[PDB]
Structures are given as structure tokens and as C-alpha cells.
Paper text:
The yeast lipid flippase Drs2p-Cdc50p is primarily found in the trans-Golgi network and is involved in protein trafficking between that network, the plasma membrane, and endosomes. Drs2p belongs to a large family of Type IV P-type ATPases (P4 ATPases). These enzymes translocate specific phospholipids from the extracellular side of the plasma membrane or from the lumenal side of internal organelles to the cytosolic side, creating and maintaining lipid compositional asymmetry in eukaryotic cell membranes. Drs2p-Cdc50p is activated by the binding of phosphatidylinositol 4-phosphate (PI4P), the Arf guanine nucleotide exchange factor Gea2p, and the Arf-related small-GTP-binding protein Arl1p to the C-terminal region of Drs2p9,10.
Author numbering:
A (entry chain A): 196 to 583, 597 to 1241, 1253 to 1309
B (entry chain E): 21 to 359
Amino acid sequence: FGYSDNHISTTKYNFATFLPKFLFQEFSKYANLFFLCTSAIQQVPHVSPTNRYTTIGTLLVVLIVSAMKECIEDIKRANSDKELNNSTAEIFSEAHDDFVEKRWIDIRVGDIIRVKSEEPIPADTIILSSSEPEGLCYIETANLDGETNLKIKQSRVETAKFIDVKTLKNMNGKVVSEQPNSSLYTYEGTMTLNDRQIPLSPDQMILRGATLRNTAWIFGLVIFTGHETKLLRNATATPIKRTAVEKIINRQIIALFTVLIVLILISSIGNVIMSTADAKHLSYLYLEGTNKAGLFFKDFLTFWILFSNLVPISLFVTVELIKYYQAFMIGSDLDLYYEKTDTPTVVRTSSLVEELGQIEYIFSDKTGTLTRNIMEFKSCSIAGHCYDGIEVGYRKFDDLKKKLNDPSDEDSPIINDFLTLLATCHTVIPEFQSDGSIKYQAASPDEGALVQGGADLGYKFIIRKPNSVTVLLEETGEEKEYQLLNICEFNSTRKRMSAIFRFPDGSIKLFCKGADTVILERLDDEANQYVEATMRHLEDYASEGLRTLCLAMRDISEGEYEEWNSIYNEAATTLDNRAEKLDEAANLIEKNLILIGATAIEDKLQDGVPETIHTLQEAGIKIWVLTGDRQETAINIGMSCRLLSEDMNLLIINEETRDDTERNLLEKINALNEHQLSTHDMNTLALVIDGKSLGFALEPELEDYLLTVAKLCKAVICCRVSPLQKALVVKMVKRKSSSLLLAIGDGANDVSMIQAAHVGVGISGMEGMQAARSADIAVGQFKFLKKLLLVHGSWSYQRISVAILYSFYKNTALYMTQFWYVFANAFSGQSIMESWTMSFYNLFFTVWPPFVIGVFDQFVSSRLLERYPQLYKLGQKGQFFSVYIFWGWIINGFFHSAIVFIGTILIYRYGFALNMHGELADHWSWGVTVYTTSVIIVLGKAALVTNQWTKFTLIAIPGSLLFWLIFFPIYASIFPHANISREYYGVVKHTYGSGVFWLTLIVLPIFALVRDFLWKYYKRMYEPETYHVIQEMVQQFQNAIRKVRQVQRMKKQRGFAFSQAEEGGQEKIVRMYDTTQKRGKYGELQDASA
Amino acid sequence: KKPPNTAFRQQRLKAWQPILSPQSVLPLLIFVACIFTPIGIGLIVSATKVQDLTIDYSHCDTKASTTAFEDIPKKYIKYHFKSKVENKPQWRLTENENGEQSCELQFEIPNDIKKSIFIYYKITNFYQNHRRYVQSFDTKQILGEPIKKDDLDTSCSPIRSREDKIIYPCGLIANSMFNDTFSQVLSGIDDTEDYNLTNKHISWSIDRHRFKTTKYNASDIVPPPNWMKKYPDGYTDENLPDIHTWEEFQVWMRTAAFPKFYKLTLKNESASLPKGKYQMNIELNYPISLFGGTKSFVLTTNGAIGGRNMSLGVLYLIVAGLCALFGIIFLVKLIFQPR
Ligand SMILES: *[C@@H]1O[C@H](CO)[C@@H](O[C@@H]2O[C@H](CO)[C@@H](O)[C@H](O)[C@H]2NC(C)=O)[C@H](O)[C@H]1NC(C)=O
Ligand SMILES: *[C@@H]1O[C@H](CO)[C@@H](O)[C@H](O)[C@H]1NC(C)=O
Ligand SMILES: *[C@@H]1O[C@H](CO)[C@@H](O)[C@H](O)[C@H]1NC(C)=O
């Protein structure tokens, strides 16, 4: 009664999980805990050398701005969740009987819905009725599971009579359903109709993430909804993913906290030594308090506040604005824009953007991500001929031309039976459209490719009748009438299918297609006549990643089909095991075939996929394929997308219950004990795992043992993997031997695999859409990961590296004068600058130069960064951003603060550095002198660390100097009169009226800029080894690995793949359909013609 | 929808990338050296142009001469005139029960210094930049407001209140102030000049707007305990100090940044100081032993930098040296590297 709604909220927070998840997301970084506690203990009286509310104020501004970026981010994903949630849905209403165009949100449990065809399904529905004979319907679960075939979803016989929209008012009762757990292939339930109990099963269990194909409509009683569904259950929270650059930021905050406690110990022990040694010479302080441990604690807190600004307060905010604004500028690129379905490459989490320069492993989906889910009839090895550049259609004009050579051509009955085999031996359904085109309803895209390819070559397939005729249409002829006698269903232990026919002259003939390892064991072909040329054309097909079948025939006499039809009739009516006895019959009939020829279809990859995978493997990235589809399909796709090259060994591992260590121990004993050069042995070796062979091999007795020596492969193609074990692979690789991972998928079989990654990319566009909305980056097409990753991650990591190291520099370049003055104040804790001017330093006047370093600069152009994918390996090793280089920047801030300090000591000696009538520059005139000098050394350094100068760098690098030189008389001339900074009375007249203030600002920064200007000259005129070295950069072990069990060479591959399941429908479908007779009065009603 | 093809949005902004050829960096270094050499010469010359005279008179009472004009030891005198000083500065210590160890200092100005002359007291090792020190003054109370008890600034804490009364100039700065009253005259001996000086226009112009005469009636307040010798009976309506007028209080309240500082007392900006022998009479009220360093008076005639400080003058020449030392390294290296 308290069931969920149908919203897929991929929001990072909803209403009440904002404040704990955002405050935990902010205080997981140490430079906000540190200012929470140096805000809290700054409230202790007579301790704060700055003010009570400085760190309160700027920490509050940091918290509000980070909550603003968090809020705009979560709104920009909230209207995308709402964009998926306002999708159409036809819902039966109790008031009036018509299905009305509601939204997905208004669907509840127990709600009869109607979905149309080739359009997605909103909820887990029991099929109660359909427009097809006996109420069946098809579905393509390429987002539930990953297989590209279609699935029979039969409705029950007692409920399929509710075809009419008007008559489902008396459909009353209940559904005692399953618990909402996430077993995809499993369902248990008992529907109660008006009188009877109905047993339920996963047969009538259309799930959420898949689309209804090749029907007209269904009627679906909604059971599970939203996150209650089987596919989106343990898969939608938008977790806090700590990027790998902010982790090493956190150990740099540990590093600066170490040098902090070194300075507070040096400083406060100096306060003990001077405060007890010269106590007779400090009598003008009245230090009558003899508690030296108490004043050690209080003064410890004074240096703990005064030194507290060495870690930058505007660190995580300015990194969130660089990451957010880079994520804006890469989600708005024409080179990453996919104009076919209008998707502008939106980046959602916006904080995992420098992860894109860190990626070492990519864990891709196959179906939809790598492929277009289309199968085109590419080629046909037909009587031993493909071609003699690549020409394929010229064979087809040589085929229509060679067929019309009927007086003098030996091949003409053979190619006639091959083209008959392409358009008769199948289970596709023809659909007469309204226009002048026919649409083939195919449960196999293999069979749809074969029938559409036979229709593009003469024989157009026209009408199926159930236990009756099966007519075609020739281009030369008019129409030929066949007669489908028997059908042999496809099976994975069978690897073939067959169909006994009756030609219109009365000749009963068999047609059969399948794998050569199964077909070729069962034929003669008159002493292997067409066999060997068929073999070498299978090797020509499998070398290009083409799905391949061996298409053969034989002949049957009248008495052989008489007695055999009898035996198959008593074989089909057995309820013990129909599949096994039909296999035993269906290979007692398939002796001594004649190999007519072979076919070749391609699974039609997404655009730019082999170029992308090739230029990512050049980037040092190891693409693994986590698919839910079959092994042979993914070997043909990895062969077609150039993962599997020529001469690659395919370490197959198809385990059993405890037969795991035989495969792993044999492959690793036979892999490690012999050692080649092992650089060109990486590139000829690949791993193929099952899903049952990986649920047994992802367990801690085999887990590190799998990765740390089976990462010696070039490609790991994990085949037929559930949505759970995909996430187990990603978590398993990011935990043991922690690299930086990327996940890309199209549908919600990958949503657990995308959220469990360091950065999870999703494919937006077509019917696979749920993975893109719950992603870190939604991308239109897989080829945009090449420019999104190599250009927009190498920029996003190097610019953020120089920005973070610069901000550490600038904060220890201002606030380290505070420590050099401890030596001169009395080891007392005297702040040099005014209180709010420091907050203005790390909030107003040095916060934009890191922003324009981190965005508007480039250190490599986008041309040479994608012409040389080798330059991506500069980021994977963490070369630009470490803790050693961090010590270079921090020590640079120490040297610059040291020479600003010592310089202004010697310049403003005695305070006697004014010409204005004998007056003296006080504490605070000197304070804004070292403040301003530190501003000019700091943005001068930001001028030295930008490579290119945009118009926004001229706003931030000199315009922050100009904005302080304009800001300071306004502030120090207005705000002292408002009792806010009363330390600034007369400081404008005694600084900007001073000759030696502007003289100090001229030269005293040019000392520090002499050091960094000459070093920045030297490291690009005589030390060029950042980019240019990278630009200027056997058979016995193979015989050993071929001897290992389950290792398959490339040269023996014949490329068989046939997407058809056992619950996909072969023998039931043909006996039901009519193409001639039209619809009924209610929907596209086809009667049960049986 | 489709993003715009603007140069901003598509990261095609008009960016200038400076190549660091030695046709650009090396004339920059020769130009920066060529422009910071003559200014740094002009800032050593204008810092060696001023003519000061510092006499450490801190050990005038314990060294006591008290009967004649005997010489000051060379540890204590520092003079930087244009001419050389023929007769060394003398010192004595008078005592006549009302002067209370005044230290007559008798120096010889050797040239008529025509720029405006300014008399400071230099105090070494007085940590006036201490954390407990640059606080400890009630800002509303130096404005003249009768700030009562429990409304006073708590930073004045040891020098905040007394025997059921409050201290009007509370805290550490407004206690503990330098009270060696310099005489308003450089008394010329042997009939040279009899040169006058003023304790007016000595502080900042904004201190004379903030430090105002108080609104107490001298029975609610009490003087701070260090200068209780000038007010032995306490505060009366007649002797109560005008903080707006005293103006040597508010040069002390303007706390300096360093332990070694000047503070202004006297000046004369309208006449030259001729080349006579001048007797400056300093009433020693402020002991050494309070702080831990030397008290000295400076007679200086500041310039564009404002004192004899060659630091920024030689500091244009360190930068102008490195822009010429590395402009020869990165040019002899630039020739000999493809040689
Ligand atoms: C000048 O200042 C000194 C110290 O700043 C004063 O000396 C103090 O006088 C009070 C009252 O006589 C004593 O209680 C202190 O112990 C003295 N401190 C010392 C000697 O270090 C001196 O009285 C002031 N002279 C004046 C105001 O004429
Ligand atoms: C000038 O000096 C003489 C000599 O001490 C003095 O009497 C006179 O008052 C001074 N004039 C002033 C201070 O205006
Ligand atoms: C400066 O000194 C001269 C004597 O050389 C004197 O006449 C004049 O009044 C003094 N000016 C001031 C402002 O004290």
C-alpha cells in the first residue's frame, strides 16, 4: 500500500540528505575541517590575533559558494531526471475507459498500461494482453542484459482475451507478486482473476529498461515501479566520488599541517625562551601570570590562528569553479556534439573532470556503446566466391548476373538454393506497411539481416501462413510458393538451425545454417568440393569481425519424410524433455548435407569506434569490455573494433564449480615462467571470461590472483556478465591495485558499473538512456571519448595541477611573512596585515588568477594532443601534480615571503621611511606594504605560469593588482569611519602618499620574478624534456601459450555468431502468423490461426 | 540543443602566447637593469644626502660625569654629516632636586643643514609590536568618551582599572610611554644660534582628529600607574591632560612595527640649522631597565626615502645586478651553446 513512485531520481541529494552529504562532502577535505576548528578556537577570548569572525566569514563564503555549485549541479540533473520522468505513458482510467496520455510519474502498482512499439517501457509489467496470436509479444533486452536478440513474452491464455479497451472493466482481482529483489531472469507470482488462480513466471515479465519491439501494443499490469524495479534497485544514489587529485590535495594538507605544527612549535617554544629569559626586560607587558603551561596553550592557539592561513581557504571552491567551468566548456563543444539526435555532451557531476587525464583502464559495454544494434547483410561466400581494395556488391551484380546464365552455369541451382536459403529458412515475420516497403519482424537480427539481404538480391519475402504456404517474390520472376514442413530450433549446444521445406514441384528439401564446427561434421559435399573455399572465406570473414554462418542443404525422399515425419511427430509431443529429444531427432535427420555456401553480416559498430579504441590504446589505456551478450558476439565485436588484432591468443576461461585454478594456474604458470621482451607480448594476448567463470573468479582466493598477473593482456573481454558482476569488476579493479578507471555504457545494465567507477561516462541518444542520466558525463557517442578524454582531460588535469600548486604557493607566499615576523614581534603572535585584508586576499584579489590558470590557459594545443596520444601518458603517471613538486611550490612561497619580509624590514627601518613632514610609517602602513608587495609577487608568478594570455587572463592577472590599488583607498577611506577596520586611519596618506611604497612595489616583486622569470626562461629554452622526449620516443612463449587449455588462435577463427535464445522463439512463432489477413476491430488484432 | 560556435564557447579565444626568445627576454633584462641602475643610484645618493646624528644617552646616569663636559664614547655617537665633525659630542648629568638627573648633550653640527630637521628618539629592544601591546587602548576612550567600568576595552586588562576607579588612558601603550622630556630648544653654546623647535604637527593628521580631550570630571578616573610621578596626587580638573593637545602621547600610541624604532618629538620646518655647537637638554625620566635596550635621540633631516637607509637603493642594484649578471649568462650561453 506504501509502494514507490515511478521517478528515477538520480539526484545527489533529495530534500533532507543535503546537509549531511554536503557537509560530509566538504569536511572530507581537510582544509575545511582545519578552518572549522581554527574558526571554533578563534572564539577563545584574548587569543585571536586577527578577529573573531574572519575565518567564520570566509569559511562561510566558501561554504555558501560551494553549496551554490552543488545546488546548480543538482538542479541541472534534477530537470534531467524530470526530463526522463515526463515521458509519455497510456494509463487505463476507472472513470472513462480510454488510455490517456499521462506521464511516467503517474504510474502506480496495479495499473494497467498500454505501451506502443519501438518505444520504451516505464515499469515492470505483467503482460496480460497483446495484439498477437495467443497474446505473445517481443522485447529487446539490450538494456536489461545486453543480448541483441528478442525475447518471447507470452501472456497467459486465461487473460489474453482482454484485447478490448472497453472490456477490461470486469478484470478484477489481485497479484500476489515477488519481493522486489533484483534477479532479472527470475519472477514468481500468482495472479488472481475474477474466478481462477493464474501461475506466473518470467515468461510474462516484461521489465523496465527494455523496449517493446515488433508488436503493436500490450496491456501491462504494473508490478514494480521506479527504484522498486529489478534493474534500477541497487543502482541509483549518485554517490560522493572523491577524485584522485583531491586525495593528493588532502595529503598536501597533511604536509602543510606538518609544517604548520613545526612553525607553531618553533614559534611557541621561542615564546617560552624569550618570555622567560627576558622577563625583566618585558616589564612593559605586565606578565604577572606565572602559569607558563597555560600561556603556552593560549599562545599556542594564537600561532595556531595566525599561521592557520597557510592552507588555502579558497582552495576547494576555486577548484570546484575550475572543474565546474571546464565541465561547462566541455559540455558545450561542437567537436563533442552529436547532431543526429541533438545531445550536447553534458557533464553532470562536474568534479570528476581532471579524472579524465588520469584514466588507465576503460570498462566499456559492447551493446549500444560499441555497436549501433543494426545488422546489415555484408557478404556471402556463395558456391566458393566472395571477390578477387574491397568490393562486395560487385559479387552481388555478378550473382544476379551469374544466375541469369541459366543455360551455361554450374552454380545456378546452387546459388538459387542459397538465395532461397536466405529468404525461406528463418523465423522472421513480414509486416505489410502502408507505404511501398515491407518490414521484417525478426527475433534475431541475424535472421533479419539474412532475410533483408535476400530481399535486396531478388527474393523478397512476402507472406507467412501458419502450417501452410510461405511465399516469396523474385525480381525476374513474380512469386514462388514454399511450404514449411518442419523447423529445428536454434540452441547454444546445437549452434545451428534447420528447416525442412516442400518446394512447389513437390521436392522435399532441407535447409540448414550454423557453425562449421557443427555443420561441417555432418556433410559430404561430394568429397569436399565447395568446402575448402568456404573455409578460407570464413577465415576472410572472421578476420574483419563479421558474423558468419555456414549455409547448407540436403534432399529428402517421400518415404524418408513419411517415416521421419512420424518419428518427429512422436518426438514433438513428449513432455519429458522436448529440447533434448528434438535435438536427438534433429541430428538424426541432419546427416550428409551439401555445403552450399556461407554468409557474412556485420553488427554495424558506432561511428569512429575502431579509431577511438586504437587512439586510446595508444594513450596507454587498456579497454576492457564488460558485456552481457554471448562470447562469440563479443569476440566478433572485439575483432571488428580492432581490440582483437591478427595473431592474438585469446586466453579463454570458461570455468565450472571448482575447475577455476586449473585454468588460472595453467595460464599463469605457463605465462610467468617464460619471459619474452614483454612489450610486444602484451599486444598479442587477450582474456575472455564468462559470467559464471567470473563470479567464481571474483572472490579473494582468486581475486588479486586474477588481476595482478592477468592484466598482462591487451584486451579483457568479459562476456555475458550480469549488472552485478560488472560493478564487481570495477570495484575489484579500483580496490586491488588501485588505478584510475573509466566506465561507459548505454543502458541500465551498466548503471551499477558506471556509479562504481572513478568517472562514469554514459551514452545518451537512443533507447539506451538510463545510464547517461545517472552518469558523471553523458556523451552522445562513443567516439567523443577520444577528444573528451585525451584533449579535455589532459587540459583538465594539467591546468588544475598548476592552479592547485599556484594556490598553495600564493597562500604560503602571503601568510609566511607572519612567521618571519614572529622572530621580530616578540615571538608574540602579531598579525602584520589588517584582519579583513587577509580575508580579502584569499577571497577577492588572488582568487581569479587560479581560475584563469585552470581554464583559459593551455600548455598543449588540441592539435598535437590528439595527433600524439602518447602525451596522455604524462597524466596517468601523475607527473604534473605530486607532493614533491608541491614542496617546490611551498618552498617557493617561503622564499618569496622571506624576501618580501626581509626586504620590507630593511626598507621601512625604524618606521622612518616617509617624506611627509617627519611622520613615521607605522605597523599597518608597513603591513599593507608587505601585503601589496606579496600581491604583486603572487600575480606576477601567475603571469609567469600562464602559457597563453586570453582577455580573461588580462582581467585576472593585472586587473587584480588594479582592483586592489583601486580597492584600498575606498576600503581604508570609508570603513575606518564605520568602525570596521580602525587600523587604517591615515594608512592611505602614509602608503599611497609615500614615494617609498610605490618604489617598494616596483622593485621588491622583481627580485622574486627575477628568480621565476629566469627559471621559466631556462625550463623552456634549455630544459625542454616535458613534451619533446615523448614526441621523440618470441615464438617459443607463443608456442607455450598455444599449448594451454582453452587458448584460441586468430587464424583458426571462423567467426560464427547467431543471436537467438531458447526463449526467443523458433518453432512456436511460425505456426501462428498470417500476413494476408488484416487487423481486427480492436487494435492490430491478429487471430490465433491454429 | 546545439552549442554556439562562438570563439569564447568553443575555446578559440584570441590568446597571445609569448615565446621566450632571447630577442625578447634578453632586451627585457638589459632594459630592467638599464632602468633600475639609475634609479638605485638616485636612491643611494638621496639616502646618503641626509645628515643625522644619533647619540645613545641611555648610559648617561650610570656613567655619570656631573661636573664637566667629557666626551661621549664612540659606541654611542653616530653622525653622517657632509662635513666632518671636528669636536666630538660631550655629555654631562645635572641634578638640582627638580631636574632629577637631566642629561645635557652637547653636539657639534658641522654644516648649515638647510632641509627641515626632525628630532626623534630611537628606542632599541622595545617590543612595541607585541601582540598584547598593539591592542590595549580603548578606541572610544581616546575619542574622549566617558567610558565607564565594564564598558572599557578588555584588551586594557592589567591597566584597565584601579582602586574602585578606572584609568583614563588605559592599557599598555597609554601606560609605559616614553617620558624623557626633550627640551624645545637646541641651546646653542658659545653664542651660535639658540635654535627653536616645536612639538606641534608631530603626529599624524588623523590622530589629531581621533584623540580628543576627554569628558570625565577627574574624580571618576585615575592616571595609569607608570606615569604616577607626574601626577602624584592623581587627576584634578586643573592638571588633567588634553590628549588632543599633548601630541607626544599620540606619537607613542601610533605603535611602530619593529623593536628598533624612532618616534618623533621635535621639528623645525621653517629655518635652517647652522653650524654651531648645540646643547640639547634631556630630562631622564624613562629608565633603561623598563625595557631591555638603548634609548637614543636622532637629529635627522630626511629625504625622498626619508632617512639614511641605503636598503632600497642597493635593492634596486641587486635586481639591476641580476638582470645584468644573467643577461650576460643567457647571452654568452646563447652564443656558445650552438658554437
Ligand atoms: C617616566 O616613566 C617611568 C617608567 O615608564 C616612571 O617610572 C615608574 O614610576 C612609578 C611611579 O613613580 C613606579 O611605581 C614605577 O616602578 C617606575 N618604573 C620604573 C622606574 O621602571 C617614571 O615615574 C616616569 N616619570 C615621570 C612621569 O616623570
Ligand atoms: C625661542 O627660544 C628661546 C630660547 O630658549 C625661548 O625663550 C623662546 O620661548 C623660543 N620661542 C618660541 C618657543 O616660540
Ligand atoms: C626655527 O628656528 C628659528 C631659529 O633658527 C626660529 O626663529 C623659528 O621660530 C623656528 N621655527 C619653529 C617653527 O620653531
